[model samples]
Target: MLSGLNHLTLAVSQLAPSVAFYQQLLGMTLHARWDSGAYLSCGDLWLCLSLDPQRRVTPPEESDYTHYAFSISEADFASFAARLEAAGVAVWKLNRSEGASHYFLDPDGHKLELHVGSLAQRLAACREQPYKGMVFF
Candidate 1:
């Protein structure tokens, strides 16, 4: 069969800034770096940022419906939010939904989420919220 997620490759216009941002934000240690890309590890997950200079960068017409979510402790979540806010990153309010509690997005518009508790708790919490099919607006 299959193991867990090996890694995720993300296309970015610039590499250094994204790499640095993720490294600092997630407290990830740099595992490898090369001319084409860089890799960082946070816990067991690996995040790879690849560069594509020939490609043009554009803003999203709307908020991204898809994103990546990572698990964290309550203290870590607080630290992350504070650091993000201090860095002037677009750190939005934590959505206490049934699925997870996390943040979203990278500088290049890639979305990232940090889940800081049990999925069961999150699901229960989300069940209490009014259902709105449209999550993006």
Candidate 2:
């Protein structure tokens, strides 16, 4: 049986810049480093940035630009935002009726979101009130 996502591999034009970007912006610790790739950890998820100088593989179309969302607790969101902005990274803000948040892309243009609250917290709240198809499975 499948457990969970082990890691996500992202192709980058250069490794050092992407490594520095994630290290400074997301506070991701260096799990492993090699000539062509580096591993970053955010809680349980692993983000692998791979260097491909030849651009052998093409990226998805513009319509598929938006890819993934990552959740973080409210307490950590502010600090994370501040770090990114201080580094001169472009942050995209999103406002929902429930709350407000933001996202920024990696050097490889992988969309990453910093959501308020852990997934477990959101699931628990949903379970107690059952907000319109919200369920913890």
Candidate 3:
């Protein structure tokens, strides 16, 4: 079985801005970078941004719903959301019973979230909140 996520490579249309956004806005550490690609560390997770001069990478749309969310502590959610807002990033808030979170999009239209709590914790709260409805509205 897979022990954990090794890395995630995102096909970015513009390389420089994407790299900067992750580093500046999201706090990812840049390990190495080249003309068309860069590698960064998100704590223990590895993230890669790849690009090609001639090829275009189709960015994710709203309906894709394939966003990769990063977990943040509940106490840090407010400040984190404020940080993103101050950076001029648009935050789309999600109303849920547990693990409060808000969605935000990157420059390339990739959706991400600053999530609080865990999926296991959310599931536990699911049984209690009968009126929470489904995942999305």
Candidate 4:
């Protein structure tokens, strides 16, 4: 069985700006970079931004809920949301979930979310307000 995530690579149309986006805006550390790609890290999360000609240039429709979420401390959620707002990225979705979440799109139109909750909190919420056919194992 898979233990955990190894890393995630995101294709970007432009390497430099995306690198700046992750490093400057999100406070990710840039470990190394090349002409077409870069390696960065946020906490222990390894991220790769590769230059891709076919990268998404526009946001997907609202119904397309595919996106990756990065967890943040609840105390830092508001300030982090402010940081992203200051960077001018468009809000891809509004907060309406278990905890404070801000959905935004990266420069390449990749949907990303910053969330301030854990799986335990989610399951606790589910226990209180179980879905139509929710079951616990």
Error of 3 at 129 (Å): 4.5
Candidate 1 pairs with clashing backbones: 98-122, 98-123, 98-126, 105-112
lDDT of 1 by residue, 67-110 (tens): 78788777667777677778877644458555446565677777
- Residues 1-137 of candidate 4: C-alpha lDDT, one tens digit per residue: 99998899999998888988899889899999988899998887999999999886775573377788998998999999998888788897788778999998988888999998889999999999998999998
- Return the TM-score for each candidate structure: 0.76, 0.72, 0.81, 0.93
Error of 4 at 42 (Å): 0.9
Question: What TM-score quantifies how close candidate 1 is to the native fold?
Answer: 0.76
- Local distance difference test, per candidate? 0.73, 0.71, 0.79, 0.88
Which tens-of-lDDT digit does each residue in 1-137 have in candidate 3? 99989998877889889988999878899999998899999888899988855444334544477788887888988998899889898655565545678888887767788877876776667656644465622
Tell me how far candidate 4 lies from the true structure as C-alpha RMSD in angstroms.
1.4
Considering every candidate listed, which one attains the maximal lDDT? 4
Candidate 3 deviant stretches above 4 angstroms: 52-63, 129-137
| Top TM-score prediction, candidate number | 4
lDDT at residue 108 of model 2 (Cα atoms): 62
Clashing pairs in 4: none
Better of 1 and 3 by lDDT: 3
On residues 1-53, what C-alpha lDDT tens digit does candidate 2 reach at each position? Answer: 99999898878888888888877656778889999999998778798888888
